[PDB]
Symmetry: D2
Subunit: 140 residues, 4 copies
């Protein structure tokens, strides 16, 4: 299964898939790099037998709580992994918060994100974040 | 954790959560009822310590392939579980297909769905489906 | 064109289409009822020749600013009008805010809404809002 | 108002805003370039008084029918215009089709798109489309 390994976005987030078999996979998701306070558990599913010549449909979930922080939000990513020699994952993501009944309309944010095997340079991360941080960065 | 148990929508789909602990849960998802050919594995995450007076943020994923069928698609649900005496889960869902590069724009469908502990009557399921089937029903 | 007229949701919002011709339409959108401080200009487009036996694809936009308030947000609705004797509009909506570059990830909320020709009772509006206000209600 | 003028994406689509005043704007949208058969009418709204230091919230709609073609779909874009010396519009889009009641779940596609004042080179358009066409390209 091709989704195994480490994946980077353009803003400095890192997803690590540690195990993948029979349509399920598991790992971690860090919005930062190398700090146990913004790493979180990840779980997902994938198409274990994709149609010839197409990408591999994928999806996964991350609850933004660990032993050190709780943002009271959970994100899901939905998209596909594209092999070839240039490996990519293209997704749209949703981030949902727990709310009171009156605040249910402002419970879910929507965005997009793209992952690559090529770790971007720190210079590229700074230019990209300056144009805008488009991946979820929930505080506190 | 409140999400344990069986959940129904208004169109005849059934989600069963068999295990939930430390922010993770697992189970099955059936678009039909009681037939091993449209049951699929489910995995997700939830907020294990929600803020007082708010709903519990949740998310989960289902790959639409089993031993009998493969739709080449994977769905993710994002929303929150609301306790009280009237227990509900309100979500928005995404369904992503594997595609060629030229077809990437038509890879992801978007919708909404609401789950209840009250199993609807067959009469209510028929009236609801006649107004429109708004939950994912991917063929073949 | 069938979209002409007045449309209600279940939470107390009212959309009035005053003119519709050649694929375009115009009107107003009130999150309240009968108060010039939460009425806003609406503009949209529709399919002027839908396929036989299908709904009519629609879309429209509302900027949440008038002479009395400005929420600094703009919403878009996307879906279809369904005729027959029971007329409905089913949509998903997006609400986007202006942000700094660092806050771009929290710029867009996502939701769903359904419109009917039947004005709901005030009792039905209160029960529905108590279960949750799922249409956009941006403050200030 | 800054949104006036011509905007390009990375896949070869062109949006022209011909008029903008008092929170409304109008123009055209071409998925191709310079051919009256894939140009369509556009209408939208914007925040006419954005908060200092933030982007300008925007939204607009395009029905994919003209005198020569009808795709039976309507798209909406939701996001914000960002000024400075590097002018951009970042959006998420929805494309909704008219359907039968049973097919309502597959009525709406979701995607993302980014617009610039810099017209990309034909070489850049080909490389980008080869990685994937991520803007709406509805056939027939």
């Amino acid at each position: 299964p091709g989704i195994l390994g480490t994946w980077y976005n353009q803003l400095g987030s890192v997803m690590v898939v540690t195990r993948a078999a029979n349509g399920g996979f598991v790992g971690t998701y860090e919005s930062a790099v190398g700090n146990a306070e913004k790493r979180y558990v990840m779980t997902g599913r994938y198409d274990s037998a994709p149609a010839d010549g197409t990408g591999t449909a994928v999806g996964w979930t991350v609850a933004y709580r660990n032993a050190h922080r709780n943002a009271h939000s959970v994100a899901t990513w939905s998209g596909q992994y594209v092999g070839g020699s240039q490996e990519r994952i293209v997704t749209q993501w949703l981030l949902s918060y727990g709310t009171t009944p009156a605040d249910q309309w402002k419970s879910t944010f929507l965005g997009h994100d793209e992952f690559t095997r090529v770790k971007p340079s720190a210079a590229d991360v700074e230019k990209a974040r300056q144009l805008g941080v488009t991946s979820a960065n929930p505080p506190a």
